[PDB]
Amino acid sequence: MLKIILPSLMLLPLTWLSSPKKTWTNVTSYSFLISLTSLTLLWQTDENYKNFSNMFSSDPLSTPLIILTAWLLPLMLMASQNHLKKDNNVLQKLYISMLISLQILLIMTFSATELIMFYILFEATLIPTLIIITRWGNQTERLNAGIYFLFYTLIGSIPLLIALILIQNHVGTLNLMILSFTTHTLDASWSNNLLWLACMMAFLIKMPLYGVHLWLPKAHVEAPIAGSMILAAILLKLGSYGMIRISIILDPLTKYMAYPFILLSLWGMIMTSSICLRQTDLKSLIAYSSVSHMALVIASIMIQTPWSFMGATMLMIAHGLTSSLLFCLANSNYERIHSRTMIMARGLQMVFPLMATWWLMASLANLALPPSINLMGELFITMSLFSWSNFTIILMGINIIITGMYSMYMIITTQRGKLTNHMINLQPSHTRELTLMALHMIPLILLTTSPKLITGLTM
Amino acid sequence: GWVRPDLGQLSKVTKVKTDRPLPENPYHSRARPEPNPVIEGDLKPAKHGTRFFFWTV
Ligand SMILES: CCCCCCCCCCCCO[C@@H]1O[C@H](CO)[C@@H](O[C@H]2O[C@H](CO)[C@@H](O)[C@H](O)[C@H]2O)[C@H](O)[C@H]1O
Ligand SMILES: CCCCCCCCCCCCO[C@@H]1O[C@H](CO)[C@@H](O[C@H]2O[C@H](CO)[C@@H](O)[C@H](O)[C@H]2O)[C@H](O)[C@H]1O
Ligand SMILES: CCCCCCCCCCCCO[C@@H]1O[C@H](CO)[C@@H](O[C@H]2O[C@H](CO)[C@@H](O)[C@H](O)[C@H]2O)[C@H](O)[C@H]1O
C-alpha cells in the first residue's frame, strides 16, 4: 500500500509548493493518477488476500472501500473549487491539505492489519473533519455540529479502546489474521455482554444506529460540500467496516446480543424514511436518507450470513456513490440561491434540462431501480433478513414504499411544476458541475456491469 | 624500681599474646540469605524489535 500512500503524501508538498494559479489543476490531476494506481489492488487472481507487510493488507472488503476513497479525493476538490474562489491563497491550500489528509488516513484505516492501528487512524479523521465543518461551514450552527460530531464519536470510542486493550492483554496481539485463526468461543457471562457492547457501540454510533444518529443530520446540514461528500460516502462506512472486522471475535454472543440493534435498525429505518417526507430542508432530506440506508447495513451485519454481508458491502459502495451525488446536486442549487429550503426553488427542469437528468438518475439509484447495485444490496439484505425471520418483510416492504415517495417527491418538488421565475440568478450549469455528476454516475453504471468487484468477503 | 610512663605511653595500642581461641561468630549471626542468581549471556537485539503494538521495528 506504500505505493498508494507515499504518492498521496506527496500531494501535500505539491499543494504548498505549487503556484497560486496551478494549485487546483496540479493537485486534481495527480489525485486522479493516484486513484488509478489503487486499481492494482483489484489484481486478485486467487483466494488469498493481499498481505503487503506487517502493517497493511488488502481484502475484498477493504479494496472497494480503499478505491472509493482514492477516487473521491479528486471529486471533492472539484466540488470545493467554486465556493472557495474568494479565499486567499493560503486558505485554499489549507483546505486542500485537510482534504488530502483525510484521504491518506482513510486509506491507512482500511488497509490496517491490526485493530489498535485501525482505532488510532479511525480517531485521527476527526481532526481534519472537525476543521472542515467548523472553519468552512456557513451557518452559526456549525459550532454545535462540530461538538455533536466530535463527542458522539469520542464517547463511543473510549469503551472500544478499553475493549481492544482487554483483547490484547488476553490474546497477546491485535492482528486481524491471528485473531481470526485463533478465535475462541466466548462465554455468555455478564462481563462478555459488556465486552460486546464495548466493541460495538463505537461502530454503531458512526453508522449511525437509530437513536444515536442526531449527529449526522447536524453535521451534514452545516458542512461544506466536500464535508458532506466524505461524511456520507466513507466516514459512515468506517462503522460498517469495523463491525465486520471485529465481529469475528465476538461469537456466539451476536446470536442474542444483536436483537436490540436489529430492532432499532428495522424500526429505526422506517422512522427515518418517513421523516424525509416532511423534511423542509433539501440537504436534511438526504442526510436522513443516509440514516435509513445504513439501517439495513447494520441489520444485515448483525445476522452474519453470506448473503447479508454481500448485500451490505454492495450497499456500502452503492450508497457511497449515490449519497455523494445527491449532496453535490443539492449543492449546485445552493451555490445559486444560497437557500437549502426544498420548496423555495421549483420547476428547475425548465432551465437546467441536463442537470435535471442527473437528478433523475441519482433519484432512481436512491430508490434502488434494478439492475443498479443499489437494488442488489437492498435485495440481498432482504433475502437474508427474510431467512433470519419472515416478518421482517413487513417492515422492509413499508420502507421500500416510503423510499419511493421521498425520492420522487424530491424530484417532483424541485425539478417540476412551474419555474420560480423570480430567480434571475439561475446561471447555466458549469462544465465543472456537470463533470462532477458524470464522475459519480459513470462508475456506478460500470460497477453494475461487473458486480463481482463489490461482493465482499463471503462472496 | 617503678618508672612512671611518659606522656603518651599509656594511650598506645599494644599487642597482647593469649592462648584463648579467636571467636569466629561473635554476633551469633545466621547464614546470610543467598543472592539472586545472575543471568549469563551476551546481549542480542530484542526479538522483533520493541514489540510495541503495531510498530514493526
Ligand atoms: C491530522 C490532520 C492535520 C491537522 C492540522 C491542523 C491544521 C491547523 C488547524 C487549525 C487552523 C489553523 O488556523 C488557520 O490559520 C491560518 C493561518 O495560520 C488562518 O489563515 C487566514 O488568516 C490569517 C490571518 O487571519 C492569514 O495569515 C492567512 O493568510 C489567512 O488565510 C486561518 O484563518 C486559520 O483558520
Ligand atoms: C450512547 C452514547 C451516545 C452519547 C452521546 C453523547 C453526546 C454528547 C454531546 C455533547 C453535547 C454538548 O451540547 C452542548 O450543549 C448544548 C446541547 O444542546 C448546545 O447548546 C445548544 O442548545 C442549548 C440548549 O440547552 C442552548 O443553550 C444553546 O444556545 C444551543 O447552542 C451546545 O452548543 C453544545 O455544545
Ligand atoms: C461504559 C463503559 C463500559 C466499559 C466496558 C469495558 C469492556 C468490558 C470488559 C469486560 C469486563 C471485564 O472483564 C474482566 O476481564 C478480566 C481479565 O481481563 C477477568 O476478571 C478477572 O481477571 C482475573 C482472571 O482472569 C482475576 O484474577 C481477577 O480477579 C478478575 O478481575 C474477567 O474476564 C472479567 O472480569
Point out the residue among A55, A168, A174 whose CB comes nearest to the CB of B56. A55
Beta bridge partners of A51: A57
Of the candidates A328, A317, A343, the residue with the CA atom closest to the CA atom of residue A430: A328
Phi and psi torsions of A23, nearest 5°: -60, -45
Sign for the CA dihedral angle at A330, A290, A360, A420 comes to: negative
Cα–Cα dist A32/A113, whole Å? 26
Q: In Å, how far is B30's CA from the nearest CA of chain A?
A: 44
The answer to whether residues A193 and A200 touch, using CB atoms and an 8 Å cutoff, is: no
The answer to whether residues A392 and A266 touch, using CB atoms and an 8 Å cutoff, is: yes
Cα–Cα dist A329/A165, whole Å? 43
Cα–Cα dist A426/A338, whole Å? 11
List ligand 1's pocket residues with C-beta within 6 A.
A 88, 90-91, 101, 124, 127-128, 131, 135
Closest CA in chain B for residue A53? B56
Cα–Cα dist A419/A410, whole Å? 15
* CB-based contacts of A209, cutoff 8 Å, min separation 6: A261, A264, A265, A268, A295, A298
* CB-based contacts of A336, cutoff 8 Å, min separation 6: A423, A425, A426, A427
**Does B53 sit within 8 Å of A54, measured CB to CB?**
no
List ligand 3's pocket residues with C-beta within 6 A.
A 159, 162-163, 166, 170, 191, 194-195, 198
Ligand nearest to the CA of A155: 2
**Does B54 sit within 8 Å of A116, measured CB to CB?**
yes
Cα–Cα dist A28/A33, whole Å? 9
Cα–Cα dist A227/A264, whole Å? 27
**Which protein residue's CA is at the shortest distance from atom 21 of ligand 1?**
A91
The secondary structure of chain A, three-state, reads CHHHHHHHHCHHHHHHHCCCCCHHHHHHHHHHHHHHHHHHHHCCCCCCCEECCCCEEECCCHHHHHHHHHHHHHHHHHHCCCCCCCCCHHHHHHHHHHHHHHHHHHHHHHHECEHHHHHHHHHHCHHHHHHHHHHHCCCCCHHHHHHHHHHHHHHHHHHHHHHHHHHHHHHCCCEHHHHHHCCCCCCCCHHHHHHHHHHHHHHHHHCCCCCCCCHHHHHHCCCCHHHHHHHHHHHHHHHHHHHHHHHHHHCCCHHHHCHHHHHHHHHHHHHHHHHCCCCCEHHHHHHHHHHHHHHHHHHHHHHCCHHHHHHHHHHHHHHHHHHHHHHHHHHHHHHHHCCCECCCCCCHHHCCCCHHHHHHHHHHHHCCCCCCHHHHHHHHHHHHHHHHCCCHHHHHHHHHHHHHHHHHHHHHHHHCCCCCCCCCCCCCCCHHHHHHHHHHHHHHHHHHHCHHHHCCCCC
DSSP letter at B24 equals S
Cα–Cα dist A105/A234, whole Å? 11
Of the candidates A304, A438, A447, the residue with the CA atom closest to the CA atom of residue A376: A447
Burial of residue B17 (number of CB atoms within 10 Å: 0-12, 13-18, 19+) = exposed
Q: In Å, how far is A167's CA from the nearest CA of chain B?
A: 12
Which of A194, A199, A205, A212 maximizes ligand 3 atoms within 8 Å of its Cβ, making it the mutation to test the pocket?
A194
Structural domain spans, chain A: 2-459
For residues A185-200, one letter each, b for 16 or more C-beta atoms within 10 angstroms of the residue's C-beta and e for the rest, the string is: ebeeeeeeeebbbbbb
Task: For residue A166, report the distance from its CA to the centre of ligand 3, in Å.
Answer: 8
Beta bridge partners of A341: A281
Ligand nearest to the CA of A95: 1
Cα–Cα dist A18/A161, whole Å? 40
The strand pair at A57-58 and A50-51 is best described as antiparallel
Closest CA in chain B for residue A54? B56
How many degrees, rounded to 5, is the angle at CA A57 between CA A233 and CA A69?
Answer: 20
Cell numbers at A111, concatenated: 488497509
Cα–Cα dist A279/A264, whole Å? 21
Task: For residue A194, report the distance from its CA to the centre of ligand 3, in Å.
Answer: 10
Resolution (A): 2.8
The answer to whether residues A78 and A436 touch, using CB atoms and an 8 Å cutoff, is: yes
Of the candidates A157, A155, A137, the residue with the CA atom closest to the CA atom of residue A146: A137
Whether the upstream peptide bond of residue A208 has omega within 30° of 0, thus cis, is yes
Cα–Cα dist A16/A94, whole Å? 9
| Ligand 2 binding pocket includes A214 (Cβ within 6 Å) | no
Best of A54, A111, A122 to mutate (most B CBs within 10 Å, chain B): A54
Cα–Cα dist A405/A396, whole Å? 14
**Does B53 sit within 8 Å of A114, measured CB to CB?**
yes
**Does B53 sit within 8 Å of A55, measured CB to CB?**
no
Chain A residues near residue B54 by CB distance under 8 angstroms: 54-55, 112-114, 116-117, 174
The answer to whether residues A238 and A246 touch, using CB atoms and an 8 Å cutoff, is: no
Cα–Cα dist A377/A64, whole Å? 15
**Which protein residue's CA is at the shortest distance from atom 2 of ligand 2?**
A156
Of the candidates A310, A330, A307, A328, the residue with the CA atom closest to the CA atom of residue A318: A310
**Does A174 sit within 8 Å of B54, measured CB to CB?**
yes
Chain A residues near residue B48 by CB distance under 8 angstroms: none
Task: For residue B52, report the distance from its CA to the centre of ligand 3, in Å.
Answer: 22
Residues of B with CB under 8 A from a CB of A: 53-54, 56
Closest CA in chain A for residue B48? A54
- Closest ligand 1 atom number to CA of residue A88: 31
**Does A53 sit within 8 Å of B54, measured CB to CB?**
no
Residues of A with CB under 8 A from a CB of B: 53-55, 112-114, 116-117, 168, 174
Burial of residue B3 (number of CB atoms within 10 Å: 0-12, 13-18, 19+) = exposed
* CB-based contacts of A57, cutoff 8 Å, min separation 6: A49, A50, A51, A111, A113, A177
Scan for cell 451557518, then name that residue: A139
User: Distance of alpha carbon A264 from its chain centroid, rounded?
Assistant: 20
If phi > 0 it is left, if psi is from -120 to 50 it is alpha, else beta; for residue A183 that is beta
The answer to whether residues A311 and A379 touch, using CB atoms and an 8 Å cutoff, is: yes
- Closest ligand 3 atom number to CA of residue A162: 6
CA dihedral A41, A4, A376, A364 (to 10 degrees): -140
Q: In Å, how far is B36's CA from the nearest CA of chain A?
A: 29
Annotate B6-17 with DSSP letters as a single string: -TTSTTS-----
Give CA separation, A341 vs A96, A305, A349, A452, B50, in Å: 29, 41, 17, 40, 57
* CB-based contacts of A163, cutoff 8 Å, min separation 6: A195, A198, A199
How many degrees, rounded to 5, is the angle at CA A373 between CA A68 and CA A217?
Answer: 65
Phi and psi torsions of A114, nearest 5°: -135, 145
Q: What was the elucidation method?
A: cryo-EM
Scan for cell 432551465, then name that residue: A351
Cα–Cα dist A103/A234, whole Å? 10
The answer to whether residues A349 and A267 touch, using CB atoms and an 8 Å cutoff, is: no
Q: In Å, how far is A117's CA from the nearest CA of chain B?
A: 6
Scan for cell 472537525, then name that residue: A130
Beta bridge partners of B36: none
Maximum Cα–Cα distance across chain A: 68
The secondary structure of A421-443, three-state, reads CCCCCCCCCCHHHHHHHHHHHHH
